[PDB]
Ligand binder design. Structure first.
Ligand SMILES: [Mg+2]
Ligand SMILES: [Mg+2]
Ligand SMILES: [Mg+2]
Length: 536
């Protein structure tokens, strides 16, 4: 009877993913060759009498090529040997790479390694300003700082300014790699995205590439992409048979972008079931955010919220017709989840996701009420509600549903809101509010968290946005600290939370709503990961 209309742009993909016939002959050919190159590479790693720097370059290259998930053991064993040896008689380049690789893998190497490259003020020696490879590796390393690493405080600023100064005169592909790093650092990037770029734009054009590794990475990428395309087809069909495109026209039609999201959380083959479960959840809760924001009268959203808490088809008759559509879809979804996990006896664990979703829906209704009433809460009260509305507690919990190694102890840990999870949630919230403002406010909004922060601290819109971006930086330090050993749960269950944070940085790069406006940002990513193969 109202009714908003956000004039949302419609899917730009149409039919093109709906049907994918895997060429089983080609798939077997790639798998055949890859097995050979895998052992060729495993033996590269197990080689002895290698220099520290050669070893680190090898691992770095393998990781960036996106084929390191084949060698978790090997790479672990090497980094552990390096961590425990205390070698540090090296140059900036090697020291910074050593720092980053060990930190990314949970090894708490001391940042004292950088002391020889600084003066008595802890500022980096400007004499290093012409070691471009050293600057490059420091830049990268500077993004894995924790709160205990204040010695690295100058690293980003210092490395950045001299990389920018150097870049135009560098040879290719190094120039392209510097320019790219300045725009998207490795640590905070989505792995498949960074890998596609590296393989195709950098390593393939290096004078000195290892041909075995190059071939390995191209084949493995193109091969996993076939699986991804199968999943998206299967998911596109699921979505199309739901026809929310017409029966729920008010919502954003973005299931492909949702798949990209799930692919960001994990790309590995063994997580196929998990990806498919996750993306269904992502796109489904996306419908709900679109009902509480626009098209949602306070009256109507109330009954829905009560229906979700009670969680029972018997309550559909209490709902407006269009809300019935969404609500049986949700309940049906969770019974699918139950039967899909029925075989593995892991059926019971579904209720962890459900309770998180109830939590999300509850806080959606608060947010709605705040707009209609026009209530601009204190920023503290605002976050105690807005954190869950990111859906990230919920997505994190969902991402475990498909992982077969996930035990109840894992869910119990996740349920207590661990610091790594909250940091990821915080990064999503503050970056969303910076980037999707004003989108929002362009639906005449006033409930926005930015406007809270302005009214609360008596500060300008630009000022508030900074202080928010700052909260994101603090939270990255807590994510990096969350990965350090001993870890509260297996690294396997930490990486999806890290990847959730990465997806935020990537989707809202340059402060734009990449999800609502996939055009500029996400479309290229989707094309490179899901449409175009790597030319062999
Ligand atoms: Mg919204
Ligand atoms: Mg919302
Ligand atoms: Mg927003």
């Amino acid at each position: 009877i109202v009714r908003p209309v956000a004039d949302f742009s419609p899917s730009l993909w149409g039919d093109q993913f709906l049907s994918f016939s895997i060429k089983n002959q080609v798939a077997e050919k790639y798998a055949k060759e890859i097995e050979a190159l895998k052992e060729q590479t495993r033996n590269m790693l197990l080689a002895t009498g290698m220099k520290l720097a050669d070893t680190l370059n090898l691992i770095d290259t393998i990781e960036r090529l996106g084929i390191s998930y084949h060698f978790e053991k090997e790479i672990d064993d090497i980094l552990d040997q390096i961590y425990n040896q205390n070698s540090n008689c090296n140059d900036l380049c090697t020291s910074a790479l050593q720092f980053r690789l060990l930190r990314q893998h949970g090894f708490n190497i001391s940042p004292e390694i950088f002391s020889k490259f600084q003066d008595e003020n802890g500022k980096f020696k400007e004499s290093l300003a012409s070691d471009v490879l050293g600057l490059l590796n420091l830049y990268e390393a500077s993004h894995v700082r924790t709160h205990a690493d204040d010695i690295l405080e100058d690293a980003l600023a210092f490395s950045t300014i001299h990389l920018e100064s150097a870049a135009p005169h560098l040879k290719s592909p190094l120039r392209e790699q510097v320019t790219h790093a300045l725009e998207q650092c490795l640590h905070k990037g989505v792995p498949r995205v960074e890998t596609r770029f590296f393989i195709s734009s950098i390593y393939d054009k290096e004078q000195s590439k290892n041909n075995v590794l190059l071939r390995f990475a191209k084949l493995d990428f193109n091969l996993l992409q076939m699986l991804h395309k199968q999943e998206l087809a299967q998911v596109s069909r699921w979505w199309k048979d739901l026809d929310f495109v017409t029966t729920l026209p008010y919502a954003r039609d973005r299931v492909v972008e949702c798949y990209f999201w799930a692919l960001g959380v994990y790309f590995e083959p063994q997580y196929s079931q998990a990806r498919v479960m996750l993306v269904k959840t992502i796109s489904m809760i996306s419908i709900v955010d679109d009902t509480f924001d626009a098209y949602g009268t306070v009256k109507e959203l109330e009954a829905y919220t009560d229906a979700i808490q009670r969680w029972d088809i018997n309550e559909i008759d209490r709902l407006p017709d269009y809300m019935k559509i969404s609500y049986k879809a949700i309940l049906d979804l969770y019974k699918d989840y139950e039967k899909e996990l029925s075989s593995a006896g892991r059926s019971h664990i579904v209720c962890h996701a459900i309770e998180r979703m109830k939590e999300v829906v509850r806080n959606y209704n608060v947010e709605s009420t705040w707009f209609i009433e026009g209530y601009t809460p204190p920023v503290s009260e605002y976050l105690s509600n807005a954190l869950a509305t990111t859906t990230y507690y919920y997505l994190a919990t969902t991402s475990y549903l498909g992982m077969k190694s996930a035990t109840e102890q894992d869910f119990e840990w996740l349920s207590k809101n661990p610091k790594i999870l909250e940091a990821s949630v915080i990064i999503c919230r503050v970056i969303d509010d910076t980037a999707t403002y004003e989108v929002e406010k362009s639906r005449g909004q006033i409930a926005t968290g930015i406007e809270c922060c302005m009214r609360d601290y008596g500060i300008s819109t630009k000022e508030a946005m900074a202080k928010f971006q700052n909260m994101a930086e603090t939270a990255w330090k807590d994510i990096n600290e969350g990965l350090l050993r001993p870890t509260p749960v297996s690294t396997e269950f930490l990486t999806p939370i890290l990847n959730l944070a990465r997806i935020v940085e990537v989707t809202y790069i340059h402060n734009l709503d990449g999800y609502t406006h996939p055009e500029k940002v996400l479309k290229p990513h989707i094309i490179n990961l899901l449409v175009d193969s790597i030319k062999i």
